Amino acid sequence: EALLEICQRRHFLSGSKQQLSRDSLLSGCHPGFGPLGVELRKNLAAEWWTSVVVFREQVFPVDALHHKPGPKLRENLLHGALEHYVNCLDLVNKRLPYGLAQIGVCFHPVFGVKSIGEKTEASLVWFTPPRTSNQWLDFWLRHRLQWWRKFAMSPSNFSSSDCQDEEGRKGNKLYYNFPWGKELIETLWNLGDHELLHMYPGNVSKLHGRDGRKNVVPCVLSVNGDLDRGMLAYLYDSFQHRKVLKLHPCLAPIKVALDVGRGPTLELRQVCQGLFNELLENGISVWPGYLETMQSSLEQLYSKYDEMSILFTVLVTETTLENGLIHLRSRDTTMKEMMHISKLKDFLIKYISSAKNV
Amino acid sequence: ALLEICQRRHFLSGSKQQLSRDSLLSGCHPGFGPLGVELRKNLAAEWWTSVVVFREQVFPVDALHHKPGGKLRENLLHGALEHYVNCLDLVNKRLPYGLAQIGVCFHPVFDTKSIGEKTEASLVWFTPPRTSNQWLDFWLRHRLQWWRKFAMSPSNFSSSDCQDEEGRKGNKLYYNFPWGKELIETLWNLGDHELLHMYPGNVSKLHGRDGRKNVVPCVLSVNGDLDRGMLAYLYDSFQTRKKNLHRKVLKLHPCLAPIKVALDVGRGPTLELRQVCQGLFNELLENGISVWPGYLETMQSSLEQLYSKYDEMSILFTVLVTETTLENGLIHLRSRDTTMKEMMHISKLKDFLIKYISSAKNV
Amino acid sequence: MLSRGLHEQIFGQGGEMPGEAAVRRSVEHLQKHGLWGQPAVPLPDVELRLPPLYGDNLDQHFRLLAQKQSLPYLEAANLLLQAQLPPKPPAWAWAEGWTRYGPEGEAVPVAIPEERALVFDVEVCLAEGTCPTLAVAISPSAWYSWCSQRLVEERYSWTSQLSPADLIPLEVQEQLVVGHNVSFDRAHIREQYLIQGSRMRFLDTMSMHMAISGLSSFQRSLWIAAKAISSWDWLDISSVNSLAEVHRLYVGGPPLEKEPRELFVKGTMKDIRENFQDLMQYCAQDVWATHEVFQQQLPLFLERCPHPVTLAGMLEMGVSYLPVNQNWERYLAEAQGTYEELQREMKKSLMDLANDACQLLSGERYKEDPWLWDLEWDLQEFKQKKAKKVKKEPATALGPCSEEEEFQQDVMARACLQKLKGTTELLPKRPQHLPGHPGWYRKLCPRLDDPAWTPGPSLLSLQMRVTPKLMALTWDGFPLHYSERHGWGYLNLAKLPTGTTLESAGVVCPYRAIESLYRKHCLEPYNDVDIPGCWFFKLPHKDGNSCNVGSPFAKDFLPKMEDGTLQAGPGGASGPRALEINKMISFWRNAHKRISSQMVVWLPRSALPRAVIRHPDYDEEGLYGAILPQVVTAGTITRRAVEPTWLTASNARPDRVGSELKAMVQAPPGYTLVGADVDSQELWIAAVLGDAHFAGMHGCTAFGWMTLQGRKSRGTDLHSKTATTVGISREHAKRFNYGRIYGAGQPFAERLLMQFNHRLTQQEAAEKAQQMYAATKGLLRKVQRETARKSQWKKWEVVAERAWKGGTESEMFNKLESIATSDIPRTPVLGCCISRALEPSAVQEEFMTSRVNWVVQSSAVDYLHLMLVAMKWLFEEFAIDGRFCISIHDEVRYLVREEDRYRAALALQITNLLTRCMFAYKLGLNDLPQSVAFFSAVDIDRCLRKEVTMDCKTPSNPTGMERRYGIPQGEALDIYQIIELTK
DNA sequence: GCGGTATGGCACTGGCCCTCGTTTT
DNA sequence: AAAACGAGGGCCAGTGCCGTAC
Ligand SMILES: Nc1nc(=O)n([C@@H]2CS[C@H](COP(=O)(O)OP(=O)(O)OP(=O)(O)O)O2)cc1F
Ligand SMILES: [Mg+2]
């Protein structure tokens, strides 16, 4: 709709005129991403790795090869995690069931001639005994659903479906309502030991891990989420005469932007540079609109900063060079406020830290 | 050339015996271990911090791994060059400005027929022709400075001034491995040739405001192999005469170190208020510091064993929780740089770790 | 042509003054000495139309010039002397700008205090400087108090604008400002930073005090100790340069009170306004005391320094000017970055060595370490007190699953954790340093509650006394030590006994690892104490040392580090590299404060010469500004310049970090600096003081002939002739000669020449004995040389003859002592007496060397003044734009423009010629040699430096940065006359 | 029989004064 | 419960070596 056009003028996506359709975006075919989309994906992947690093006991990060080891590109992100299974058995001391998480750029064929598409997906291979495989699968189902639910503006938009077959005893797929069509966002399967037993026969005496004075070949849980589809999901979830993207604070790429109000004066640039350094010193993404070079209107400026999903806009007028007061302006409430420049850092940090809840 | 056993025992690399210098320098290695990919993670993050974030006019770019028209990309420079116009639109034609990206590249290699992939962090710096060489020297000095820190011996990393076949100036960065120097990062000043070839029609969409006039941007480029860099720091961390007493430990910089602290349980056995360890664990990971859990263990062995086990993993501090700490509140601590027992408080330990890393980042 | 060297001059037709007997004695002297192998190489004579002389001699020329150049300022000073003082106001006005206090101390709002002359002392809050905040100035008419814009609470942004105090009056005579350390106040003047100007000059009471009754640093050291038989008679006739002290000296009134809180340097802007009235009062007391002191000093100074040349010379010497731009800020940033990097590397290596050496604490294995056994090695674990009770021991008091139903057990463990946390805080008190680590390691760490805490062991040094012993091997030995001196180095049988006993309890001292280390060293008390290196057992004593001071630590022994002995381990070339790192940042370590804090005011595009704007340079949004060097006009000795930063500014070395500091003073576009360096001044001065005393001509001495014989251009000077003996070129030979003139001590010349030549002591001693011929000879029981033909006699009464003393043969030290024996002014020529504390009247005086040095260096400073007034005389008379001066003792650089540079260099040559002719005339005859009349090197370029070609370290590429090049000069500048119409 | 004239910095040290715990109404 | 004395760390100035220039 009118969302795909505000992602072009605000550089969420790459420059395109024909491959800007929803079908091409759902496809791996690209025209990749603009800086905003890249930062959004990086924050998303960071929160993904954070939502699995808090998980007890221990999950080890790995990286798989992209091409075929014997000469070709990878489709799934399971094989490379299965290759490092026997190795990562030593680090866990073969003690308990354990997993391996990894985020990578996987490929898939897209159909004149046919081409190839890319997608950045995050996978988790959870090795666990067959008797406690299904329960842990339901566990991961709940935790992943809640994971998508946290940063969501609406929990009803994300759905969870159950399924099964002959190869997979029980599997679950996480869908997302658009609502132009519910789409796949993440797959959760419960593959048997067959996949692992196929690449190590044998003598298979290495594969079985200890499970309380018991030797047993572990069943394999296949978690596989898409961060591109997730990015688009949150983008469509944030789209709200107003055209403002209300992305989650912890997820939003740029969370603050500061310009000047008084005419082009060096001192204003000095103060703004100071605030720039102070805000970047505490890990706060800030857009520098004080460069500037003209500072035309304020309404189209706020419109631009709202289409870029900036949490707070800051204005450094000439009064700031006297009292230190500065012009804040929210996004979710769009309230024109004013506060001292020294208490800005603490306010932003506290506001970001207050968004940490489940 | 014997620390490999330390890399296999504690997985900073693969456990395969076939890990020759060629196999590691070509990028044909089966893959890095968890500690290795974590080390590379923190190294790449430290790149991203001291290249993209602090310096304005630099924005992240997402280049694809292939071409729409099988072989892949050899460098992530071209894909960044493709995003020149839009990134010019978001900067309002204010050059100099750059595009940075950390992506894995694929290099064809004829083993004397295979293909070796390796992670590379590249930055393409679009700069006016009037100040091309100045920015070249600037980035040379700053990249070299970025690589000379974190090192226990900065004298190994060197730079070389070299010219192109046409005459274009450029600089290479080397690290002194035990078998000789090796290229780890390359800097070149491309004379706006490729950009002219990419946009033959309208060259008006390429003009960037130098200040009082719009000019055709000269294309600077710096590509840094983070795999060879990770191996370089991995070698630099490891120790060499009349020391009279030697211990096995790799001294990685506290910033890029894979696992920061290591929590364990002492005395031993003690049940069952050991749930405090979980508290300290989540409290630690909440602040973003890596903590190794020493709960479920088969040892039950000499303290020297797991101390050396932690020093082989370059773990900064070893925090020990015993029953006396359960009584008062003063846990034990053993630094890696200087093996010495030290008592400390809990939240004081947290803030000590945070301040340790934060100040380590500084001078 | 003629008389062995003279040029065509119109400075007096006669003249000889032949002195046939005298020149016969000189020729006979120079024959037996003996030098009679003349090279006969006539220098190219120059024929040019000299500027108009005023007559009769050049003495009255320079006198009239100096008088007319300093007449208005003398009038103004006289207006200050006969000034009737109006009383201090009852209250100070709290308003921005100037406030005039006239009748009954009323407040009259004024922008600029229009006065002929006034006293001045500015104030500045150091907490957020260097911007002026307060000022007080009294005048022969009324009082004035200036307040800065710091009266309104704002969040200012200091980029050093034109905020400093305004003092100069507009046109569309004239000014004189006196004050204690007047240069500092000058640096806070709004109109002194402009490229053009200025009519306003300054008079320093500190410099004046130094000229009248000054004293040496050695005298200062024991003057303040007042809290060598007749060395305490000058204690009450002179004083230190402090304001309270100089006031207690020249006024002798009640002791002025100083600020007890030091609020301008200790406190912030907040606590200043709270005590504004008081601080204003203090400033008023300061300017008042300064006024009194000035009033009492002016006639005294005029008496002791009768010649106006010194006056005008002191007037122009105070108005220095250094033009700069953004490249200054770039220089600061780059140099500081480099410094922080090298320091980071060094401290990283050292702390790495300190960390891996901390492991040998367990168990008691440090006692075997031949380097690490002197220090603490402590093990603390304190402390706690009992509060829990009673009578029970607190020291001893594999199942697989998948549970998650206890979702809130995490917050249970959290609650347990926090509840456990806040119950131990009251057990200790003040967080001490880490007790687990040894004492030597505790001292080598920053405090935990320190705002600038860095991880691990910091404060590593270089140049400490722990770390050098921590690693370094010691001169073909193993241990190094310190007690009264560190490891002995640089700056008929003898035996010494030995001993070894135990008694308990002292620290254990190993001496087997030492012997074994010596074994390992040679694997590739006596004997081996002379030339080889070895350490004994205990004792401790010298037992074979050359230096009588010691050297903690060896920081300038690179050739004695890159030749084998000595080296370090572990290990390799880490030693010489560490020494290199030390040598690189040696300058920036002891100057970075003075350089970074060195303020600079930027002038906008509205207050600069538009003729520069017309010049094809802006440059690209570039900021142009300047800084006044802030120099004390006259400091001992003799009345030389004294400046904290720019006088000790390092030269252009490819080794030092901030070595570019000298070449950062970049002249504005359209302008260029033209300067010159006197070659040579003090040598030729001594020469003249010899030949003029011996006879009439200039080449009638053994020493005074070689000075004016060599040419630096494709030739060999006297310094260069002594440097090619060999010999070491060239500054070293200069510091050998000039050190020989002012006391050629045998052991000093020994260790010096041996330090510079690097050889063996015997041949060196032979060379010295060969060179000691110059000072030889000299003069009941006594030295076997008197006025009688023989010393041996029987009961011969001659106590009336033991009053004469003087050397013989080559040198002329007899005259330098002749000026050092007079109990009367001793002022040659000119011609100004100094210090009632060094004058042998009522002084022992036992300060001979300082007085010889006083003579020759005063000749040098009067030379400087003469150069100044001469350069000023033909810069205003002719169309030569840019009169701003930048002088460093011998060298002097003027800020001219690109179209008047050659004529300015010509002015320099003329100046040098006239000054040389002055020194020649003041002793006779007016005739002067050839290879000494004109400058040999005249630097003409954008930034000032040493040689015309300049390389550097920090920016690596000099011309790579926006620079130009230099031009040697020369003989080609002798074609552009002083007249405007040239070329 | 004595190099001189200046400017600074850093490390080391010991004495002044404060604080805080230990010992004491 | 309440008064007193010794141990620890910071602010202070002095001293010993070194840094540079002219
Ligand atoms: N160690 C020194 N003692 C000195 O008294 N001087 C005196 C101080 S002033 C006078 C000028 O110093 P310079 O470095 O210019 O030495 P110079 O003039 O004799 O020789 P040149 O002109 O620089 O070639 O020499 C110099 C020294 F290096
Ligand atoms: Mg000189």
In three-state form (DSSP H/G/I as H, E/B as E, the rest C), the secondary structure along chain A is CCCCCCCCCCCCECCCCCCCCHHHHHCCCCCCECHHHHHHHHHHHHHHHHHHHCCCCCEEECCCCCCCCCCCCCCCCCHHHHHCCCCHHHHCCCCCCEEEEEEEEEEEEECCCCEEEEEEEEEEEEEECHHHHHHHHHHHHHHHHHHHHHCCCCHHHEEEEEECCCCCCCEEEEEECCCCCCEEEEEEEEECCHHHHCCCCCCCCCCCEECCCCEECCEEEEEEEEHHHHHHHHHHHHECCCCCECCCCCCCCCCEEEEECCCCCHHHHHHHHHHHHHHHCCCCCEEECCCCCCCCCCHHHHHHHHHCCCCEEEEECCHHHCCCEEEEEECCCCCEEEEEHHHHHHHHHHHHHHCCCC
- Residues counted in chain B: 363
Residue B79 contacts by C-beta under 8 Å, 6 or more apart in sequence? Answer: A32, B61, B63, B64, B73, B101
Instruction: Tell me if residue C635 falls in helix, strand or coil.
Output: strand
The total of other beta-carbon atoms located within 10 Å of residue A356's CB is 10
- State the DSSP H helix or E strand holding residue B174, giving kind and residue range, or none if neither: strand B169-177
Which residues is B321 bridged to in the sheet?
B265
Q: Answer whether A214 sits within 8 Å of C400, measured CB to CB.
A: yes
Chains touching B (at least 3 CB pairs under 8 A) are A, C
Which among C982, C944, C956 is positioned nearest to C322, based on CA atoms? C944
B207 plus B288 within the same structural domain: no
Which positions 266-325 on chain C have a beta carbon less than 7 angstroms from any atom of strand E? 266
Judgement on whether residues C744 and C716 belong to the same structural domain of the protein: yes
Distance (Å) from CA C738 to ligand 1 centroid: 8
Question: Is C244 found in the same domain as C110?
Answer: yes
Residues A293 and A239 in one domain: no
C336 in the same domain as C300: no
From atom 2 of ligand 1, which residue's Cα is the shortest distance away?
A: C735
Give B99's strand partners: B59, B124
Gyration radius of chain A over CA positions: 24
User: Pick from A37, A47, A76: which is nearest to A220 by CA?
Assistant: A76
In terms of CA atoms, which chain C residue is nearest residue B142?
Answer: C337
Contact, B145 vs B185, CB < 8 A? no
C425 domain-assigned: no
Neighbouring-strand partners of residue B177: B180
Helix (H) or strand (E) holding C301: helix C276-304
Give bridge partners of residue C203 from the DSSP assignment. C178
Do C285 and C370 lie in one domain? The reply is: no
How far apart CA C767 and CA C762 sit, in angstroms, is: 9
Asked if A275 and A192 sit in the same domain, the reply is: no
Q: Are strands B261-265 and B317-321 parallel, antiparallel or unpaired?
A: parallel
* Sequential DSSP letters for A164-233: --SS-SSEEEEEE--SSS-EEEEEEEEE-THHHHTT-TTT-TTT-EESSS-EEPPEEEEEEEEHHHHHHH
**Residue C265 is assigned to a structural domain of this protein:** yes
CA of C562 to C1' of E6 (A): 53
Q: E strands along C259-388, which residues?
A: 322-325
Q: Are residues B54 and B186 in the same domain?
A: yes
| C711 and C933 Cβ atoms separated by less than 8 Å | no
- Asked if A132 and A244 sit in the same domain, the reply is yes
Which CA distances in Å does C778 have to A239, C28, C58, C783?
A: 103, 20, 38, 10
- Protein CB footprint (7 Å) on chain D nucleotides: 1-12, 19-22
A209-210 and A215-216 beta bridge pairing = antiparallel
Residue where a domain terminates, one of C559, C575, C596: C596
Cβ-Cβ contacts under 8 Å, C412 against chain B: 275
Position of tokens 């400058």?
Answer: C935
CA A309 distance to own-chain centroid: 15
Instruction: Give B227 to chain C, closest Cα distance, Å.
Output: 24
Please count the residues of chain A.
358
C205, C335: one domain: no
Would you list the DSSP string of C848-861?
Answer: HHHHHHHHHHHHHH
Query: How far is Cα of residue B52 from the mean position of the Cα atoms in its chain?
Result: 14
Give the residue on A whose Cα is nearest the Cα of B362: A281
Q: Per residue in C503-542, is it b (16+ CB within 10 Å) or e — as a string?
A: eeeeeeeeeebbeebbeebeeebeeebeeebbbbeeeeee
In the three-class reduction of DSSP (H, G, I as helix; E, B as strand; rest coil), residue A2 is classed as coil
Report the 10 Å Cβ neighbour count for C564: 9
Residue C969: helix, strand or coil by DSSP?
A: coil
What letter would DSSP give residue C699? S
Helix H or strand E encompassing B194: helix B193-198
Q: Cα(B12)–Cα(B7) distance, rounded to whole angstroms?
A: 5
Domain boundary among A252, A278, A293: A252
- Do the bridges between strand A286-288 and strand A256-260 make them parallel or antiparallel, or are there none, so unpaired? parallel
Q: Are B12 and B89 in contact (CB under 8 A)?
A: no
Tokens of C246: 């100089």
Strand E nucleotides within 7 Å of a protein CB? 8-10, 12, 17-22
CA atom of C834 to C1′ atom of D7, Å: 22
Dist CA C128 CA C155 (whole Å)? 12
Q: From edge to edge, which strands make up the β-sheet containing A256-260?
A: A286-288, A256-260, A312-316, A325-330, A336-340
Question: Residue B67's CB: how many other CB atoms inside 10 A?
Answer: 13
Q: Are A262 and A329 contacting, i.e. CB atoms less than 8 angstroms apart?
A: no
Same domain, A19 and A114: yes
- φ, ψ of residue C855 to 5 degrees: the values are -60, -60
Let me know whether C481 and C369 are in one domain. yes
Residue nearest to nucleotide D19 (CA to C1'): C430
Do residues C480 and C365 share a domain? yes
Cα of A166 to nearest chain B Cα, Å:
33
Residue B117 sits at the chain A interface (C-beta within 8 Å) = yes
Cβ(C213)–Cβ(C237) below 8 Å:
yes
**Encoding tokens for residue C662?**
């000298």
- Cβ proximity of C672 and C898 under 8 Å: yes
For residue C158, how far is its CA from the centre of ligand 2 (angstroms)? 37
Report whether the peptide linkage leading into residue C174 is cis, meaning its omega lies within 30 degrees of zero: yes
Contact between A256 and A314 under an 8 Å Cβ cutoff? The reply is: yes
- CB-based contact C455 B254, cutoff 8 Å: yes
CB of B303 within 8 A of CB of B283?
Answer: no
Pairing of strands B58-60, B97-109: parallel
Q: Note whether B65 contacts A95, CB cutoff 8 Å.
A: no
- Please report, rounded to whole angstroms, the spatial distance between the CA atom of protein residue C217 and the C1' atom of nucleotide D13: 24
Q: Which helix (H) or strand (E) holds B323?
A: helix B323-327
Residue from B62, B118, B286 to probe the interface with A (highest A Cβ count within 10 Å) = B62
Three-class SS state of A135:
helix
> Rounded to the nearest 5°, which phi and psi values hold at A91?
-70, -35
Please report the DSSP string for C760-774 in residue order: -HHHHHHHHHHHTTT
In the chain, the amino acid numbered C832 is C
Separation CA C311–CA C844 (nearest Å): 31
Q: Which residue has the tokens 């494709």?
A: C714
Contacts of C103 (CB under 8 A, 6+ apart): none
Domain housing C202: 83-304
Q: Are residues C238 and C355 in the same domain?
A: no
Distance CA B320, CA B308 (A): 15
Backbone φ and ψ of B341, nearest 5° = -70, 135
**Alpha helix ranges (H) inside C167-275:** 182-186, 205-213, 217-223, 243-250, 263-266, 270-273
Nearest by CB: C570 against B240, B329, B360: B240
- Is residue C16 one of the residues assigned to a domain? no
Q: CATH code at C298?
A: 3.30.420.390
The partner residue sitting opposite C400, judged by closest CB among A135, A212, A324, is A212
Handedness of CA B351, B357, B358, B360 (dihedral sign): positive
Residues of C forming the active site: 121
Task: Tell me the residue ranges of DSSP E strands in C159-212.
Answer: 176-179, 201-204
Cβ contact, residue pair B211, C435, below 8 Å: no
Peptide bond into B178 cis (omega under 30): no
How far: C780 CA to D5 C1' (Å)?
39
A207 contacts A233 by C-beta, under 8 angstroms:
no
CA-to-CA distance for C632 and A200, rounded, in angstroms? 87
User: Would the CB atoms of C400 and A211 count as touching at under 8 Å?
Assistant: yes
Whole-number Å distance between alpha carbons of B335 and B329: 19
Statement to judge: residues C335 and C208 lie in one domain: no
> Cα–Cα–Cα angle for A88, A93, A99, nearest 5°?
45
Cis status, amide bond into C571, omega within 30 of 0: yes
Angle between helix axes C410-421 and B276-286 (nearest 10 degrees) is: 90
What are φ and ψ of residue C132, in 5° steps?
-50, 145
Contact status of A211 with chain C (Cβ, < 8 Å): yes
Residue of chain B whose alpha carbon sits nearest to that of C452: B359
| Strands annotated E in B31-168 | 58-60, 97-109, 114-127, 158-163
Torsion of CA B53, B55, B57, B62, to 10 degrees: -40
- In whole angstroms, give the CA distance from residue C138 to residue C80: 10
Distance (Å, rounded) from C-alpha B327 to C-alpha B322? 9
As a residue count, chain C comes to 983
Asked whether the beta carbons of residue C155 and residue A320 sit closer than 8 angstroms, the reply is yes
Q: Are residues C453 and B359 in contact, defined by beta-carbon separation less than 8 angstroms? A: yes
Contact C155 A136 (CB under 8 A): no
Instruction: Return the structure tokens found at B134.
Output: 């100045």
Same domain, B234 and B269: no
> Is residue C683 within 8 Å of residue C890, measured between CB atoms?
no
Does the CB of C379 have a partner CB in chain B at under 8 Å?
Answer: no
Pocket perturbation via mutation, ligand 1, pick of C890, C934, C936, C945 by most ligand atoms within 8 A of CB = C890
Residues 6 or more apart in contact with residue A5 via CB below 8 angstroms: none
State the Cα–Cα distance between residues C409 and C391, nearest whole angstrom. 34
Q: Tell me the C-alpha distance between C146 and C144, whole Å.
A: 7
| Interface residue C360 vs chain B (CB under 8 A) | yes
List gaps in chain A by the residue before each (C–N > 2.5 Å): 71, 111, 240
Tokens of A222: 């296949």
Index of the ligand 1 atom closest to the CA of residue C712: 24
Phi/psi at C710 (5° precision): -95, 150
Tell me which residue has tokens 């960044």. Answer: B80
The runs of H, that is alpha helices, within A54-170 are 79-83, 88-91, 133-150
Specify whether C329 is located in the same domain as C299: no
Please check whether residues A279 and A331 belong to one and the same domain.
Answer: yes
Q: Is the dihedral of CA A99, A100, A105, A110 positive or negative?
A: negative
Residue type, position A119, single letter: K
Check whether residue B264 and residue B250 sit in a common domain: no
Q: E6 C1' – C375 CA distance, angstroms?
A: 25
Residue pointed to by tokens 């900036």: A310
Instruction: Provide the 8-state DSSP code for C633.
Output: E
* Residue A29 half-sphere exposure toward CB, CA atoms < 13 A: 18
Close Cβ partners of C359 (under 8 Å, ≥ 6 residues apart): B245, B247, B338, B339
In whole angstroms, give the CA distance from residue C555 to residue C580: 9
Count CB atoms within 10 A of the CB of residue A59. 20
Is C356 part of any domain?
A: yes
Structural domain count, chain A: 2
Report how many domains make up chain C.
3
**How far does the centroid of ligand 2 lie from the alpha carbon of residue C892, in Å?**
9
- Chain B hits for C420, CB-CB cut-off 8 Å, are 276, 326, 329, 346
User: Tell me, what CATH number does B304's domain have?
Assistant: 3.40.50.800
Question: How many contacts (CB atoms, under 8 Å) link B and C?
Answer: 129
Q: In terms of DSSP bridges, do strands C97-101 and B58-60 run parallel, antiparallel, or are they unpaired?
A: unpaired
User: What is the domain extent for residue A259?
Assistant: 253-358
Of C538, C563, C596, the position where a domain reaches its end is C596
Cα(A187)–Cα(C29) distance, integer angstroms: 112
The answer to whether the CB of C301 falls within 8 A of the CB of C639 is no
Domain of B143: which CATH number?
Answer: 3.30.930.10
Beta bridge partners of B332: B320, B343
Same domain, B183 and B316: no
Together in a domain, C466 and C573 = yes
DSSP label of B205:
G
Task: Indicate which technique resolved this structure.
Answer: X-ray
DSSP lists the bridge partners of residue A259 as A315
Of A212, A213, A271, the CB nearest to C157: A271
H or E segment to which residue C907 belongs? helix C901-921
Query: C259: closest CA among C285, C292, C287?
Result: C285
Residue B357 to residues B36, B360, C905, Cα–Cα distance (Å): 19, 5, 60
Kindly list the residues from chain B whose CB atom is less than 8 angstroms away from the CB atom of residue A296: none
Q: Are A230 and A327 in contact (CB under 8 A)?
A: no
Of C557, C118, C597, C544, nearest in space to C336 by CA: C597
The contacts of residue C323 (CB under 8 Å, 6+ apart) are C195, C624, C625, C626, C665, C666, C667, C668, C671, C895
The neighbouring-strand residues paired with B225 are B120
- If asked whether residues C171 and C290 sit together in one domain, one would say yes
Whether C183 has a binding-site annotation, put simply, is no
**Chain A residues 58-97 with CB within 8 Å of chain B:** 58, 60-67, 69, 71-73, 80, 83-84, 87-88, 90-91, 93, 95-96
Q: Cα(C657)–Cα(A293) distance, rounded to whole angstroms?
A: 38
CA neighbor of C681 nearest in space, from C673, C671, C689: C689
CA distance B224 to B147: 10
A124, A101 in Cβ contact below 8 A? yes
**Total Cβ atoms within 10 A of residue B105:** 20
Pick from A136, A139, A270: CB nearest C157: A270
Rounded to 10°, the helix C901-921/C848-876 angle is: 130
C164 within domain boundaries: yes
A161 has which bridge partners? A173
B49 and B84 fall within a common domain: yes
Do residues B94 and B192 both lie within one domain? yes
